[PDB]
Symmetry: C4
Subunit: 108 residues, 4 copies
């Protein structure tokens, strides 16, 4: 029931979820290897080479919880502003991990 | 009960809903012909020629659901932060389609 | 139970509520004379002469409803993300009008 | 049951909570000495010297209440969009004060 959250001081990345910009350090994304955002191989497709940011044309009220999963170091909880289906599709897209997906489902 | 969401790679448009900026690809808006945002004829009035963006002086907490309708490929659901009257007026303004309007009403 | 919302085409003003920027036309603000935002006399104090915007160091989740009152042409309603006390203090500060204040109180 | 909120006119600071920018006057932060944001000693670590802003890689839906605590002059209350578990860790990080933390818990 306890998780670790990254402390500041290195490299900061900007994630643009359909106009909503999110800024986090790379160490936040590197906490969880695998996943769409964890490794550069599965996030090079969504990286815009000109704006120096990651663009996702998806629901913006969900990346608040998706980002907090990396920040909180494992706390995945759906905010009560979006349906369960929408968040399930979002977490399936971001590939948070089979164990994490099952844990979230059992928490719902 | 299933819908299709656009995949990334072309042209991206900025929609400014009373200060809240939304960025989506043109393919997201072109999923639904007709509608205010689907075709250029009904959205040239709201396009600002100088800022290169679409300005709508309306309720900003509703275009989250309006935009997701294009992103989710047909999923129109009202977020629980605005009343049914406000969202009904918004969807009537954006002209989401008589079938879509009736489907949303029967879902409420 | 019916209200009128301004149509687009003149001058647009930016209202910065503690970092959250809101853009509306003057016709939206001029719908209600009196009030803090309706007349230039009661909003010159909060106007930043350098950034060409109005700054209010107040709760940002309330100006969504405060702004919609001008947009919707008289529809004042508290969103369910802030308490009644906070919204009452906000509407008292913005001076929405004694009749409007009483109408909102009787609607709560 | 009454609190004082700062009036405008001096120095304004920008707080970037994981991409979400908050702007407040320094007098808002100086209302409460001690705390992470009250004194420069405990906020120099989180100040970005290049962007001239304070960066916190934490949950952005929680700093609305943390900022309002300084604005409202002592009104600390968790918005109903984030869990009590998440907010308790947030207020502990910002070190709102031993009396204030216990007051919030007794209010929950």
């Amino acid at each position: 029931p306890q998780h670790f959250e990254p402390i500041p001081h290195c490299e900061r990345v900007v994630i643009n979820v359909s106009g909503l910009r999110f800024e986090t350090q790379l160490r936040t994304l590197n906490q969880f290897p695998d996943t769409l955002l964890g490794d550069p191989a599965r996030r090079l497709r969504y990286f815009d080479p000109l704006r120096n940011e990651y663009f996702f044309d998806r629901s913006r009220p969900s990346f608040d919880a998706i980002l907090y999963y990396y920040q909180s170091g494992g706390r995945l909880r759906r905010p009560v502003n979006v349906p369960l289906d929408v968040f399930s599709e979002e977490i399936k897209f971001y590939e948070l991990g089979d164990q994490a997906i099952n844990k979230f489902r059992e928490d719902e």
